Amino acid sequence: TATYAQALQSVPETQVSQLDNGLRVASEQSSQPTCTVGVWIDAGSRYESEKNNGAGYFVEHLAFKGTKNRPGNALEKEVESMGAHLNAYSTREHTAYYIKALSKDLPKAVELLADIVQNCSLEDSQIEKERDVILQELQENDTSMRDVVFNYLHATAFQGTPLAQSVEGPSENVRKLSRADLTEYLSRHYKAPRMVLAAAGGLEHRQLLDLAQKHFSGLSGTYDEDAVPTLSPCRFTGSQICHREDGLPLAHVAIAVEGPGWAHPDNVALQVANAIIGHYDCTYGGGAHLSSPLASIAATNKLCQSFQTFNICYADTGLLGAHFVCDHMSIDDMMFVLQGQWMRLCTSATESEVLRGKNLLRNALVSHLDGTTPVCEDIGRSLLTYGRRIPLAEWESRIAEVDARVVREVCSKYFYDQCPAVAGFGPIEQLPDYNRIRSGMFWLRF
Amino acid sequence: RGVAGALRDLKRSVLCRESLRGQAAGPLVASVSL
Amino acid sequence: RGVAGALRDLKRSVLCRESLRGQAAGPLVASVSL
Amino acid sequence: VSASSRWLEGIRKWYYNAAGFNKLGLMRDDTIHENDDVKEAIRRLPENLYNDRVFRIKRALDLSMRQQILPKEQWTKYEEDKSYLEPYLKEVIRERKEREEWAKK
Amino acid sequence: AGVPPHPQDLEFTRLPNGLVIASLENYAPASRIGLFIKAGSRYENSNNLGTSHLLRLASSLTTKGASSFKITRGIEAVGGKLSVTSTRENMAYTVECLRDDVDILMEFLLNVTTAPEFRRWEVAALQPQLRIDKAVALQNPQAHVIENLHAAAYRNALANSLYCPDYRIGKVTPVELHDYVQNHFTSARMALIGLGVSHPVLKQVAEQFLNIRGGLGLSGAKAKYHGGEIREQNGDSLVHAALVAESAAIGSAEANAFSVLQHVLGAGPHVKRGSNATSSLYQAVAKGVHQPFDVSAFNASYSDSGLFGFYTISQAASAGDVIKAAYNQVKTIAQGNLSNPDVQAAKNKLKAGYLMSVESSEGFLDEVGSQALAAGSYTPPSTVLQQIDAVADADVINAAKKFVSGRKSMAASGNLGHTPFIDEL
Amino acid sequence: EQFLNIRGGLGLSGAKAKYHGGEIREQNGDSLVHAALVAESAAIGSAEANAFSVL
Ligand SMILES: CCCCCC(=O)OC[C@H](COP(=O)([O-])OCCN)OC(=O)CCCCC
């Protein structure tokens, strides 16, 4: 009986509080018996310099390996024994540590996150152990062409800036990174005004804020020293990187233009345009009858094994484009059909397909915020980027504002006659020359 | 997208002992979609 | 010509009981020549 | 049902025998012009009807070479002309009309 | 204040024809409807193997009420989703969309499940997708090992693979698809589950369209455990191996004992890049093996049988040392060496993992659908935790004893030069 | 004596065949079932081998 619009109002408001040391504490209560809690830190490779690049990824390997009060196995045995799950990740702008556990285990869970973020042991015997482990992971990542081609895209698109740096760091920095480099990274970036304690599930916001005062109070905050980090802008460069390797059976291509960044209202309309182009895989059932002309033609003529659009967001910048993988004789056809859809939407987008892109986005947004861990991530990441939780009803308002005119104007603002950043890897002899790619960013008929 | 679940293009390599944990099975499930 | 011995292009069909006798094996041998 | 509908059928049988493709052993659907809809319908025919269509066209092309025809006993009788392709072609057209109606929205 | 509403209860109804409707109104922006069917690969026989795979791939072919074009464009227009999930016992047609579009996707779901035409040319064009689907699946070495593990354990009906045998690709006929739907997609073999939907409309839909009278009754073709071993010498870098014995059918109290035994031994990690201290199988192998490896307890419970054991990944030369170390670790539990704190930590991992697996609508719908076919009822989570608490330490030990003394089934793939046979364990 | 005097790089191996038993089943689309049922009998040259040849 309840309508879709009415269901957006029923979602509980995300309660936000802030301690006296700058640590923000946010929660979304539900009736669940489980929950997710974690700390989102405004740190990443974009803050690291060339000498200490990969330091954050190194700390991730040491965060769960021992603390001053829980050395070695003690942390794992506590997490495992209560059936909880402990995880972490690191992007170029955000680092996160979160726990999944029962609701009754909320106080123990927060207590462990505090001991992890603040009292990391970093034993020299352990640092040498993780030195070889990260090096093996670097060899593993080399075999994932998708991870390679997207690192190349960042490397060439943001060349000369911190964003070109990968999260893992270069193999030479992992070998010469000392314990002092890591502690310097922690005291510099793991500061209370730059962290957000997020929770989601069955829990009242009071007990979270109490636990925040109980365990995170002992953390220097609101004035460290005259050592404040600040993210400068990062130059985007139209450029091309081509790793020719004819031993690999399929080529990987990633092409993109410069996006606006996290806070720009244009991201909503861009995601609608990307949803129209959508994504494809050889295991999809639709094939020729798919709505997306690129997916239909890619399946009918077998131009690729897969493609995906993306809108990667960073502070005041981003990578907007698509990535695909295909046989060595389909790289040209695939690039042609892809660019033709950017130009078609820049110039002659229609109302019905734009409604499909809005409906795909509404379904994507609600399907993603299903579970305590997705919502806990949305809380933590949003407070760092947006400084607030944007309610679902607001996203619906911005989506409903988009129409065909918005897509034509917004797509032309970022796509039409713009220099892309191209990254290629594999059998890419047939990858078009950059000038030919650059000419595909405008139409002579328009 | 097609999915194969068991834990309860050259893909990649898994060499170290840390990346191997979670690979051992724990009943297959085959999902297909549009 | 290559040979496979065991009895001690769509090839053909063997339907009746008279043509089946001798088909059952009786140790493989693989021969190759020019 | 009435004497007048037998006269419309009477001239249709006249035009049928005047069209003369029955003299070569062909059927009406053998003579249709192959557009994209017709090519798909032929593609969907079962094996037996496809092989029968192929031999009748082959036999008629052989006769057309010699400027000959079949004996009258072997001509295609108007009453026995099987519209083997029309149900397939009607469905191909119906699908295209649906694709063309979605393209308008 | 910021508190959520009062959560509704799940409505549940059995119709006299055997059909089961269960709905929950969670007031979410999205709706989710699943039709769960006892039509998994177990109901194939040696003449129509792979028919349920091709059926799983044919959800967007033409129906009597909607062409293939309309189903694809109609669902994508509202941003919806249509999925088909298969196990060895069930097929689950799931549909997702915003709650204002439930009616449209319901109509498609019923057409796909109750009025497929299986056109001769559409089916023929779909046959090569079996090769692509199977190839994508089988690049996980786990998939083929567990295919062979079931082929080795059972004489019938669970030896059947989830994926179509190669010799059958292109041979599955439209008649076999029609016969499969008429025989298995019937009222007494079905359950209509819904989220973000009212109970009356599902019950209304169930009575209007899902009243298909049984073409084949609830089959008594019981799975017959036999045991054996299948070994696949290949060029993989690591040896995958699973050693298993018949354990227990799902829903029985003995099944809960094996589930606790699974978490006493260890099944999947809890900490990113953790040493897995509380996993007795991992620590037992790490004693005598210092190379990279992985080990996990395997638990597969079905309607009329079950398979419990463990799964190993190791270097080719360490394959026997890893397997014997793991198997000996199960023996010490069967000899009685099992504390009470060890069992309680296992119950916490089990109870916690069950609750976590039903946080999402995707995991909740799958659980309710599986309970409806397996049990004909809905058991709430607090009752599930109650059943887990009722497992005694002796029940966990007797489950280990049943594994040690039971006729084994084994599947292995890799360079098997140092991988023991069953009789060598 | 001129050419075939190659001295042993590997001696006459004692890698004895170990009978174990079991079964391999191949579900395919052949028209007829082929099946062989067998047990360990005897090494060649022994008197027991001649008995199996008569059998
Ligand atoms: C009467 C006017 C005819 C105009 C045709 C035209 O200029 O051709 C296209 C190119 C430049 O466009 P592009 O190759 O970047 O393609 C853009 C794709 N979006 O121009 C040239 O360099 C080609 C040289 C022509 C010599 C006769």
Side-chain angles (χ1 to χ4, degrees), chain A residues 343 435-436 438-445:
Chain A
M343 299 303 95
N435 276 306
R436 302 289 289 273
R438 182 60 173 78
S439 279
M441 303 299 294
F442 63 87
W443 272 352
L444 296 163
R445 83 198 73 170

PDB file of all heavy atoms in Angstrom, chain A residues 343 435-436 438-445, ligand 1:
ATOM      1  N   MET A 343      28.780  10.825 -27.906  1.00  0.00           N
ATOM      2  CA  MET A 343      28.373  11.919 -28.780  1.00  0.00           C
ATOM      3  C   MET A 343      26.862  11.947 -28.967  1.00  0.00           C
ATOM      4  O   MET A 343      26.260  13.027 -29.020  1.00  0.00           O
ATOM      5  CB  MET A 343      29.070  11.795 -30.135  1.00  0.00           C
ATOM      6  CG  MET A 343      30.592  11.866 -30.088  1.00  0.00           C
ATOM      7  SD  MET A 343      31.228  13.375 -29.343  1.00  0.00           S
ATOM      8  CE  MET A 343      31.474  12.868 -27.642  1.00  0.00           C
ATOM      9  N   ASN A 435      45.210  10.548 -31.659  1.00  0.00           N
ATOM     10  CA  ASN A 435      44.559  11.574 -32.466  1.00  0.00           C
ATOM     11  C   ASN A 435      43.218  11.084 -32.992  1.00  0.00           C
ATOM     12  O   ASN A 435      42.230  11.828 -32.989  1.00  0.00           O
ATOM     13  CB  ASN A 435      45.469  11.995 -33.621  1.00  0.00           C
ATOM     14  CG  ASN A 435      46.476  13.052 -33.213  1.00  0.00           C
ATOM     15  OD1 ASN A 435      46.111  14.097 -32.675  1.00  0.00           O
ATOM     16  ND2 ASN A 435      47.754  12.783 -33.458  1.00  0.00           N
ATOM     17  N   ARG A 436      43.157   9.830 -33.440  1.00  0.00           N
ATOM     18  CA  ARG A 436      41.886   9.269 -33.885  1.00  0.00           C
ATOM     19  C   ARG A 436      40.910   9.143 -32.723  1.00  0.00           C
ATOM     20  O   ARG A 436      39.705   9.364 -32.891  1.00  0.00           O
ATOM     21  CB  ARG A 436      42.116   7.912 -34.553  1.00  0.00           C
ATOM     22  CG  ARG A 436      43.067   7.940 -35.748  1.00  0.00           C
ATOM     23  CD  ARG A 436      42.454   8.630 -36.959  1.00  0.00           C
ATOM     24  NE  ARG A 436      41.397   7.823 -37.565  1.00  0.00           N
ATOM     25  CZ  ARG A 436      41.584   6.883 -38.491  1.00  0.00           C
ATOM     26  NH1 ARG A 436      42.795   6.595 -38.954  1.00  0.00           N
ATOM     27  NH2 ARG A 436      40.538   6.218 -38.961  1.00  0.00           N
ATOM     28  N   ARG A 438      40.980  11.155 -30.099  1.00  0.00           N
ATOM     29  CA  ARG A 438      40.608  12.535 -29.812  1.00  0.00           C
ATOM     30  C   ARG A 438      39.584  13.054 -30.813  1.00  0.00           C
ATOM     31  O   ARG A 438      38.711  13.851 -30.451  1.00  0.00           O
ATOM     32  CB  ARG A 438      41.861  13.417 -29.808  1.00  0.00           C
ATOM     33  CG  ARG A 438      41.630  14.892 -29.470  1.00  0.00           C
ATOM     34  CD  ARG A 438      41.015  15.081 -28.090  1.00  0.00           C
ATOM     35  NE  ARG A 438      40.949  16.491 -27.712  1.00  0.00           N
ATOM     36  CZ  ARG A 438      40.046  17.362 -28.160  1.00  0.00           C
ATOM     37  NH1 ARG A 438      39.104  16.992 -29.024  1.00  0.00           N
ATOM     38  NH2 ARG A 438      40.087  18.620 -27.743  1.00  0.00           N
ATOM     39  N   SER A 439      39.669  12.615 -32.070  1.00  0.00           N
ATOM     40  CA  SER A 439      38.680  13.011 -33.064  1.00  0.00           C
ATOM     41  C   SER A 439      37.325  12.365 -32.817  1.00  0.00           C
ATOM     42  O   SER A 439      36.305  12.910 -33.254  1.00  0.00           O
ATOM     43  CB  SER A 439      39.175  12.665 -34.466  1.00  0.00           C
ATOM     44  OG  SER A 439      40.075  13.653 -34.942  1.00  0.00           O
ATOM     45  N   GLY A 440      37.287  11.223 -32.133  1.00  0.00           N
ATOM     46  CA  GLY A 440      36.029  10.607 -31.758  1.00  0.00           C
ATOM     47  C   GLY A 440      35.284  11.306 -30.642  1.00  0.00           C
ATOM     48  O   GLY A 440      34.179  10.874 -30.295  1.00  0.00           O
ATOM     49  N   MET A 441      35.853  12.367 -30.071  1.00  0.00           N
ATOM     50  CA  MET A 441      35.209  13.133 -29.014  1.00  0.00           C
ATOM     51  C   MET A 441      34.390  14.306 -29.542  1.00  0.00           C
ATOM     52  O   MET A 441      33.861  15.082 -28.737  1.00  0.00           O
ATOM     53  CB  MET A 441      36.264  13.644 -28.024  1.00  0.00           C
ATOM     54  CG  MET A 441      37.119  12.543 -27.397  1.00  0.00           C
ATOM     55  SD  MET A 441      36.183  11.339 -26.430  1.00  0.00           S
ATOM     56  CE  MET A 441      35.597  12.364 -25.089  1.00  0.00           C
ATOM     57  N   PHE A 442      34.267  14.457 -30.862  1.00  0.00           N
ATOM     58  CA  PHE A 442      33.345  15.419 -31.449  1.00  0.00           C
ATOM     59  C   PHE A 442      32.792  14.838 -32.742  1.00  0.00           C
ATOM     60  O   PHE A 442      33.347  13.893 -33.307  1.00  0.00           O
ATOM     61  CB  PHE A 442      34.013  16.780 -31.712  1.00  0.00           C
ATOM     62  CG  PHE A 442      35.139  16.731 -32.713  1.00  0.00           C
ATOM     63  CD1 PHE A 442      34.892  16.855 -34.075  1.00  0.00           C
ATOM     64  CD2 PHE A 442      36.447  16.583 -32.292  1.00  0.00           C
ATOM     65  CE1 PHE A 442      35.922  16.809 -34.989  1.00  0.00           C
ATOM     66  CE2 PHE A 442      37.483  16.546 -33.204  1.00  0.00           C
ATOM     67  CZ  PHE A 442      37.219  16.658 -34.554  1.00  0.00           C
ATOM     68  N   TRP A 443      31.693  15.431 -33.207  1.00  0.00           N
ATOM     69  CA  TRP A 443      31.049  15.058 -34.461  1.00  0.00           C
ATOM     70  C   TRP A 443      31.082  16.241 -35.415  1.00  0.00           C
ATOM     71  O   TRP A 443      30.734  17.364 -35.033  1.00  0.00           O
ATOM     72  CB  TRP A 443      29.594  14.617 -34.235  1.00  0.00           C
ATOM     73  CG  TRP A 443      29.372  13.150 -33.909  1.00  0.00           C
ATOM     74  CD1 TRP A 443      30.293  12.138 -33.931  1.00  0.00           C
ATOM     75  CD2 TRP A 443      28.130  12.549 -33.521  1.00  0.00           C
ATOM     76  NE1 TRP A 443      29.700  10.949 -33.580  1.00  0.00           N
ATOM     77  CE2 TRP A 443      28.374  11.174 -33.324  1.00  0.00           C
ATOM     78  CE3 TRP A 443      26.836  13.039 -33.320  1.00  0.00           C
ATOM     79  CZ2 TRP A 443      27.372  10.287 -32.932  1.00  0.00           C
ATOM     80  CZ3 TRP A 443      25.843  12.157 -32.933  1.00  0.00           C
ATOM     81  CH2 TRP A 443      26.117  10.797 -32.744  1.00  0.00           C
ATOM     82  N   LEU A 444      31.499  15.984 -36.657  1.00  0.00           N
ATOM     83  CA  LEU A 444      31.478  17.013 -37.688  1.00  0.00           C
ATOM     84  C   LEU A 444      30.063  17.369 -38.125  1.00  0.00           C
ATOM     85  O   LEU A 444      29.848  18.464 -38.657  1.00  0.00           O
ATOM     86  CB  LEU A 444      32.285  16.557 -38.902  1.00  0.00           C
ATOM     87  CG  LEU A 444      33.781  16.349 -38.672  1.00  0.00           C
ATOM     88  CD1 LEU A 444      34.375  15.527 -39.801  1.00  0.00           C
ATOM     89  CD2 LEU A 444      34.498  17.685 -38.546  1.00  0.00           C
ATOM     90  N   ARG A 445      29.098  16.468 -37.924  1.00  0.00           N
ATOM     91  CA  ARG A 445      27.719  16.760 -38.293  1.00  0.00           C
ATOM     92  C   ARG A 445      27.057  17.733 -37.326  1.00  0.00           C
ATOM     93  O   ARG A 445      26.042  18.341 -37.681  1.00  0.00           O
ATOM     94  CB  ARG A 445      26.908  15.461 -38.357  1.00  0.00           C
ATOM     95  CG  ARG A 445      26.381  14.983 -37.007  1.00  0.00           C
ATOM     96  CD  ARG A 445      25.979  13.519 -37.033  1.00  0.00           C
ATOM     97  NE  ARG A 445      27.133  12.625 -37.078  1.00  0.00           N
ATOM     98  CZ  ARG A 445      27.073  11.304 -36.926  1.00  0.00           C
ATOM     99  NH1 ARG A 445      25.914  10.691 -36.708  1.00  0.00           N
ATOM    100  NH2 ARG A 445      28.185  10.585 -36.986  1.00  0.00           N
TER     101      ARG A 445
HETATM  102  C1  LIG G   1      34.268  20.249 -48.321  1.00  0.00           C
HETATM  103  C2  LIG G   1      34.784  19.975 -46.913  1.00  0.00           C
HETATM  104  C3  LIG G   1      35.024  18.490 -46.558  1.00  0.00           C
HETATM  105  C4  LIG G   1      35.364  18.173 -45.064  1.00  0.00           C
HETATM  106  C5  LIG G   1      35.993  16.769 -44.731  1.00  0.00           C
HETATM  107  C6  LIG G   1      37.062  16.728 -43.577  1.00  0.00           C
HETATM  108  O1  LIG G   1      37.603  17.731 -43.217  1.00  0.00           O
HETATM  109  O2  LIG G   1      37.572  15.484 -43.193  1.00  0.00           O
HETATM  110  C7  LIG G   1      37.810  15.246 -41.790  1.00  0.00           C
HETATM  111  C8  LIG G   1      39.265  15.672 -41.262  1.00  0.00           C
HETATM  112  C9  LIG G   1      39.199  16.093 -39.750  1.00  0.00           C
HETATM  113  O3  LIG G   1      38.225  15.428 -39.036  1.00  0.00           O
HETATM  114  P1  LIG G   1      38.688  14.004 -38.163  1.00  0.00           P
HETATM  115  O4  LIG G   1      39.516  13.203 -39.112  1.00  0.00           O
HETATM  116  O5  LIG G   1      39.225  14.426 -36.842  1.00  0.00           O
HETATM  117  O6  LIG G   1      37.192  13.157 -37.939  1.00  0.00           O
HETATM  118  C10 LIG G   1      36.340  13.605 -36.931  1.00  0.00           C
HETATM  119  C11 LIG G   1      35.438  12.469 -36.402  1.00  0.00           C
HETATM  120  N1  LIG G   1      34.509  12.933 -35.362  1.00  0.00           N
HETATM  121  O7  LIG G   1      39.852  16.674 -42.114  1.00  0.00           O
HETATM  122  C12 LIG G   1      41.032  16.361 -42.798  1.00  0.00           C
HETATM  123  O8  LIG G   1      42.075  16.465 -42.229  1.00  0.00           O
HETATM  124  C13 LIG G   1      40.910  15.390 -44.022  1.00  0.00           C
HETATM  125  C14 LIG G   1      41.558  15.909 -45.346  1.00  0.00           C
HETATM  126  C15 LIG G   1      40.626  16.037 -46.583  1.00  0.00           C
HETATM  127  C16 LIG G   1      41.320  16.311 -47.930  1.00  0.00           C
HETATM  128  C17 LIG G   1      40.388  16.481 -49.126  1.00  0.00           C
END
